[PDB]
Structure formats: structure tokens, C-alpha cells
Design a protein around this ligand. Sequence first.
Ligand SMILES: [Zn+2]
Lengths: 49, 132, 232, 67, 132, 98, 108
Amino acid sequence: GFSEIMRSTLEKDNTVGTDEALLDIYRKLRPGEPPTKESAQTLLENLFF
Amino acid sequence: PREVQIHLVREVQEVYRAQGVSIHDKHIEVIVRQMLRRVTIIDSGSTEFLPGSLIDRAEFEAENRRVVAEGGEPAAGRPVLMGITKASLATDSWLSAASFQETTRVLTDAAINCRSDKLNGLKENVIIGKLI
Amino acid sequence: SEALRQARKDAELTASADSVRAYLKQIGKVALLNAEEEVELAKRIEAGLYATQLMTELSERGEKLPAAQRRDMMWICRDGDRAKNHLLEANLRLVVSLAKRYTGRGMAFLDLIQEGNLGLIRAVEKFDYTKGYKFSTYATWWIRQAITRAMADQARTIRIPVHMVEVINKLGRIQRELLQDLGREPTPEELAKEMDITPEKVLEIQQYAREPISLDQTIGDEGDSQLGDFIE
Amino acid sequence: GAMLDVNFFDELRIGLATAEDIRQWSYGEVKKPETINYRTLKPEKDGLFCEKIFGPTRDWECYCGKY
Amino acid sequence: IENFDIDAEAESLRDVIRNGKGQKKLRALKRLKVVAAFQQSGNSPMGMVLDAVPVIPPELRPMVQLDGGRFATSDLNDLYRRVINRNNRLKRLIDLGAPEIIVNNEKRMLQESVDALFDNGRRGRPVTGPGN
Amino acid sequence: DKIHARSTGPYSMITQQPLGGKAQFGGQRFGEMECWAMQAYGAAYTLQELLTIKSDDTVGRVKVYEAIVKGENIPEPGIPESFKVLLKELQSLCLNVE
Amino acid sequence: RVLRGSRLGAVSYETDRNHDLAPRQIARYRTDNGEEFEVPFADDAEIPGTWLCRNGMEGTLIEGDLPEPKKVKPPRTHWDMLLERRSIEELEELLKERLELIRSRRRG
Ligand SMILES: [Zn+2]
């Protein structure tokens, strides 16, 4: 909240939306296949949590 | 080119002065003469040259005497200093150049150019076991 | 959905550096069939084969060929070829499905796949439709036979005839099973009792079983040290 | 230019080898992936060590052992 | 390469490096280098394709056995075996008659095999063996 | 543990060099800088001996041995084996090495 | 300690006499694409008219010695594989049913 880093990254997000960023992470994770949004929420929990 | 020899020799010798090491400058002067063997070429002139081509000064001088008569358009030449690992690789003896780097690109052009080596350097005569 | 389709079609055609992936994508274009499709294609195959048999006995002047009859028997002759090629292109996916389980042992994957294609050719040659089954069940035997034949033939640096490879595999299966269930390592005399043979034959078979090592491994502690140099 | 190895060349011309030169150099098309027979340890016929192609492993000895 | 008069593109590239401008001129120079290289010697670009592959003599790739009969290959015999097998299989499928997906796939496998035999790992993934 | 000499002992398998190492009779690695130094002396002949007829001239080595025990003059060094190995590899890479 | 090896071949040590040899014939061979090949057989040697030459094919002898033409058999055909399970009349009825199928294709 209190940084030019957070302001500049909040403006330099260029991918807004929760599941939009889910499928963005997932299509960056896959590349080469159609994605699915619900696996994007859990493969995150798979690969780290 | 004169001062750049005197610049190279005295600066390198300045290092070995600092360690108390006596190196006679003619051991340095052999190397500096080897670096400035080639000039650069920007004009094709009249006889088959390319822009930026690094060829020998004496050979650039050699072709010009045969071409000032019958089409006196010499190549626009400029003496250039080229580095040690680069001046080594830009040799005519490809067999000597094969022991340097990625040997494929030493050789695939060589068979394309059909560049016959003349075994005149002492490096290659070591390899074939000729009397060097 | 157009965004995920666009991203998938962008990320699907990036490099195609793998020839196996290229072959997979290539063979995935022909459509599958069913039993009556097999029956129709096999009818076309046998019809074209009888057409070229009639052409073979018609190669000498047994019959004055009409134009329409010559062209329609040639149509049938090429039609059977089209049906046969259609069937092979249908069942290449079956060949892939069988070959995907016999990798990890010596041979290359595309080589296994192509030997399975040859076995699939033999299966669709010797395939019958009046027996009334799925083609895949009958083709499985021929494809797995050609796969095992290729893995017996071209998977060793020295060629071993297939029966000795079979008894080597039987010995290895018995040996892994005996090391598992016995708990400790089996004695070769007990193994010779197990395969009802002589222990000296077991030793000869084990001597045949040792695959050679390469000379081009960095066997010494130095990476530049070559194993092939240190041989008197 | 002779390859008969008399220890004087003064010249060495590399170059691309044609398919005609490749089939000119050889001693028969090797045509089997069989290196050494597993039992007799002799080189297989027309394989990657075939003595008819390359030459004999035993000095002045034909393979069947007649001469 | 068969229907390729090299002298036509040689004169075309001569004209382009004579009259052109910008990086098209230097690109035609870089092409004209190898075009005049092939034109200069008595070579031909027909040998750039390969119709018969030579085998290194087998003592240089020996199969020596050891004490206890431990044989030792030389890691080229596996590449040669793969090329030999793929060529034999391709010949069998050609004389048999097969769908062209199969034939072109076998030809591609042969091509990758030859490529790895000359230089493993030059294209794609390197072909490995035991212990990868 | 260290003193280690060889006149004529075992050889390598693929190359024809004398197999070094104290487990064998073992030569000495005549390395690159030694070739440089003996180039710098201008001693061409000793370099030719060290790179042909003590190392790889197969028919030359037995003639050297014969000339010594017969007490005759040392014959001319022939072509080294490693150069012919290089020639056969380069011919095998579809390169016409004329 | 030291591992040794032996390439499985015999090495003798004799004199290379280029004068005292077994005398020998030379048989010229002509391949399928007219290629000449001169195989040195011995003197006391039956010359086979056929010979796998250096070409990588079969090269017959340059004379008209008339070797055996085939002495072989065809392996099998797809028609043979067909005939092992079906009847000639079965295939002829399939031929007539496909003739009627191309009749419905053509003018029916
Ligand atoms: Zn013999």
C-alpha cells in the first residue's frame, strides 16, 4: 500500500480480473494446451501449498 | 599505426616494470607486428573485395599493383588493429585454425571454399609429423 | 470460447521440434471407424483384390476388355487401395496406443511405432471380416508380435536370435520374481532347477546376457580421461 | 595428388565429397545391422564388421580358412 | 539444386551489390560470398545432398572384448545400426507400398538418424544411451 | 611409488600411443608446452622423433628397434598413425580430403 | 589393476614377399548397370559366374557363361493371404456386388 512499487505494479498489472489472472498464470504454466480455470486455483495449491 | 605500436609496447612493458621483470621489448614487438598484419577494406574497387573485409596489408598492396594497370580502381583500405583471439582465427591455414574453436565452422566453409592448405606454418607440420 | 482457443492455437504451433509430436499431430487427423465401416472397407479391399486378379488373368488376351468394364474394374482396383489406406490411417492411433507401453527398453520410440505399423500392415492383410469381431483385437496380436520381434532383433549391439532372447527374458523374469519372493538372491543351480535346465547352460545364458559397455564414457576421475585409452 | 603416403605433399586440399566419390571409396555396401555373432565371435556377413567388406582380422587368412 | 543455374544468381547478385542500397546489398554480398565460392572451385552443390553415407573403417570404432569376455563398443556402432535399420525399413516399406504418412515419417526418422550420426545434439534433443 | 621408466611396453587400443601410467610401464605425456619449447629451440628432428617414432609410427617403431639392436642408422620417420586416423574420420564425414 | 583387451584376430609376423606368390587369375565381372569389376581369384579356383561385387549389388561374370536365372520363389501376396480364408466364388459375388454398387454410382 505505501510504495511507488505498489502503485507502479498496480498500474503495470495489465491483466486484471481474479480468474483472468488464474487462467493467465495457468496459460503461462501450460503453454501448449487449452486451460481450465478451476485447476488454476488448485494447481497453485498443489505446487506450493 | 606508428604510435599505436609505441603505445602498445610501452604500456604492456610498464606492467612488467612494476613487478621488476626484465622483458626486452623486441619480444613484445614480435606480437604487435603480428596484430597489424591486416588492414580493413570497404571498397570492392576493381578486384573482388567486400566492405569490412580484413585482409593482409601486403596482399592488399600485392593485388593493387596488378590492378592499377587494367582497371586502376584500388580498394579503399584502412589499417585496423585486431585482437589476439581474432587475428589467430583469421588465418589462411585452416588446419591450424581447426585447433582453435568450434571446428565445424572452421571446416564447413573450408570444404566449400576448397581451401587447399599449404603446410607452410610449423603448426600444421607438427600435426602431420612433417619436419617443421 | 475464443480467447482460450486463440491462446491454445498460438501455443500449439510454436516450434514442433519433436518429430514424435509432429507425427502424433499428423496421425491425429484421420477419423476412427466402427465395425460396419471395417466391413465396408474390407469388402472394398477384397473387391479390388479380385479386380486385380481378374486383371492378372486378363493380362494375357483371355477377354476383350470393354472401355466401361475396364475403367470400372480399375476403379474398383484403386478403390480397394483407398479403403486399405483409409484403414491403416485409422488404426495408426491403435499402433501408438500399443507402442506407448514398450518404451524405456533400448529401442527408439518412432522405430517401435514404425515396426508396429509394419505389423499393422500384416494384420490388415490377414484380417477377416466374416469372423465378425473388432479389427483392433485381431490387430493387437500382430502388432505386439512385430514389436516384440523388433525388440528381440534390433535392441542389442550384438545380434541375438530370438529364442535365446526369449529364454534370457524368461530367466530375467524368473530371477526378479525369485529375488522378490525368496527375499535374498537366488543361486544359479536353484534357477536351473526352476527353468528345468542345466546350471552351465544358465551360466552361458548369463554370459550372453551381459550387454557391452561403451568406450566413450569418462570413466576416470578426470573428464578428459578416456576409458578407451587405458586398454593394454 | 597421391594418397600413397611417401611423406612429401606440400599441399592438402580439403573439399566436399560427392556421392560418386563416397561410392568410389568404399568396398561394398554394408547392409545389415549385425556386428559380431554372439556365439562364434566372428564378424557377421555384410554387417558392420564384415571381413569381405573391410578385410581379414587374422593375418593373411581368408574367412573360411581355405587359403 | 538440379535445376539451379548458379551463374544466373551470381550475375544477379553482382548487379545487386553493384547498384543496390542498404542491407539488401550486404545480404546479397553475404549470399554472393558462398555463391562465388561454389562457382570458383571445381565443386558442385549436388554433393550438399547425400545419396550414400560412408562408414568409418571398423578398427577406428572397434569392439574389443576384455577379461571375462566383457565387450566394449565404440558408440558409433549404435548410430550406424540405427541408420542401417531405418534405411532397411524404409526400403521394405517402399517396396511394399504404404501410406505416405508412414513413408515420410520413416524418411524423417532416417534424416534425424543421419543428422545425429554426424553430430549428435546438433538438431533437437541429443540422442543418449544408458545413464542418459 | 614414483620412479617409473619405460623403454618399450604396452600400447593403447584405439590410438597407437604407449599407454601411460605407473600401473603399466608407461610413457610420459609429452604435452603442448613441451612441443612449444622444442619448437623454440628449432630442434625439428627431435620433435619429429617424439611425435612419430616414439609415439605412433607403427611400422617405424619396430624398424627403430631393429636398427638399434642391429646397430644401424635410425630410419626415416613415416606418417604418424593419428594423422591417418584424422584422415579417415574426415573422409568419413563426407569430406573429400585430397 | 590394469585392464587389458584384445581385438579378436590373429597377428603374425612374416616377410611381405612381393615376388613369391601363388599365381592367380583375374575374373572380370559386369553388374546390372554395366559396371566392370575385376575380382582376383586364385589360379586353382572355381570362378562363380555370379558375384556380389564392390558395387553393393550382384555382378555377373563378363562372359556369356549363363548362370542360373532365378532358383527362387515369390514370398506371398495379399491375394494369397486373401485366398487362404475366402472362396473364389465369394470374391466373385463381392465383385458383382461392387459392380452393382458402381452401377448405382454411375447410372442408377
Ligand atoms: Zn575363407
